[PDB]
Amino acid sequence: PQITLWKRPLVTIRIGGQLKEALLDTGADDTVLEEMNLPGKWKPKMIGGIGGFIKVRQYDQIPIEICGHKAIGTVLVGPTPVNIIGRNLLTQIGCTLNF
Amino acid sequence: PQITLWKRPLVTIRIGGQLKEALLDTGADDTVLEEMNLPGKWKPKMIGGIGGFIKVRQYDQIPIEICGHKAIGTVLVGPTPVNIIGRNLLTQIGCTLNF
Numbered sequence: 001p002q003i004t005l006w007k008r009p010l011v012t013i014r015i016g017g018q019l020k021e022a023l024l025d026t027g028a029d030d031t032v033l034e035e036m037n038l039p040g041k042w043k044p045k046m047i048g049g050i051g052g053f054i055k056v057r058q059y060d061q062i063p064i065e066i067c068g069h070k071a072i073g074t075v076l077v078g079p080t081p082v083n084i085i086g087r088n089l090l091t092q093i094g095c096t097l098n099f
Numbered sequence: 100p101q102i103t104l105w106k107r108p109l110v111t112i113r114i115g116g117q118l119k120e121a122l123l124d125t126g127a128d129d130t131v132l133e134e135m136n137l138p139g140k141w142k143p144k145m146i147g148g149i150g151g152f153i154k155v156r157q158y159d160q161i162p163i164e165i166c167g168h169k170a171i172g173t174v175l176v177g178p179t180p181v182n183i184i185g186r187n188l189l190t191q192i193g194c195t196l197n198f
């Protein structure tokens with residue numbers, strides 16, 4: 001599909017039994033999801049953007065479905081105001097910028 | 100061009116006769132540049148990112164050439180971690196997400 005940018009590029013994602021709306025975000029190196037209690041090992045991390053840093057939990061090899069496309073990779077979980085699909089998963093679903 | 104996302108989508112912009120590197124950022128509503136001088140009137144604004152809120156200077160109707168494509172619009176200047184081109188100008192240059 002082609003997504004124009006007149007509005008926020010929000011799409012439906014699935015992570016286990018949770019469907020959420022997430023931003024397709026070319027400015028994000030990694031995927032950052034709102035607080036959720038995912039199973040498995042994780043590592044603490046700090047990520048920075050406008051306003052400073054937040055503390056997140058890094059989970060690896062988490063499967064996520066994005067508009068029916070399969071992805072699997074690192075997901076950072078923490079107190080972000082919006083679910084963010086970053087480049088680590090955008091590449092896996094075939095996402096490019098075009099102009 | 101078509102830009103893939105295995106690397107950060109950094110491009111050269113021209114603003115006020117200056118060349119800068121900026122990140123094409125579909126998760127940003129606004130275009131936010133690091134501290135710089137721009138002429139004309141501006142007004143104080145606050146914007147929010149992943150880490151909280153910051154104060155910026157809002158300049159309207161500023162020309163920027165983004166990878167050879169002309170835009171004229173609102174540019175915010177303040178303590179962003181990196182120069183970011185947001186949707187307000189991505190739309191002007193006809194940028195879409197595709198997968």
Ligand SMILES: CC(C)CN(C[C@@H](O)[C@H](Cc1ccccc1)NC(=O)c1cccc(O)c1)S(=O)(=O)c1ccc(-c2ccno2)s1
Nearest residue numbers: 027028029030047048049050082126127128129146148149
């Ligand atoms: C700043 C950028 C370099 C990294 N961030 C991604 C941005 O697209 C961000 C997304 C956003 C939207 C709405 C609320 C909060 C955030 N947008 C914005 O900050 C934003 C949103 C709306 C208006 C505005 O003027 C700015 S980011 O959110 O700070 C970020 C995401 C992943 C990061 C990472 C670092 C290491 N591994 O992964 S850093």
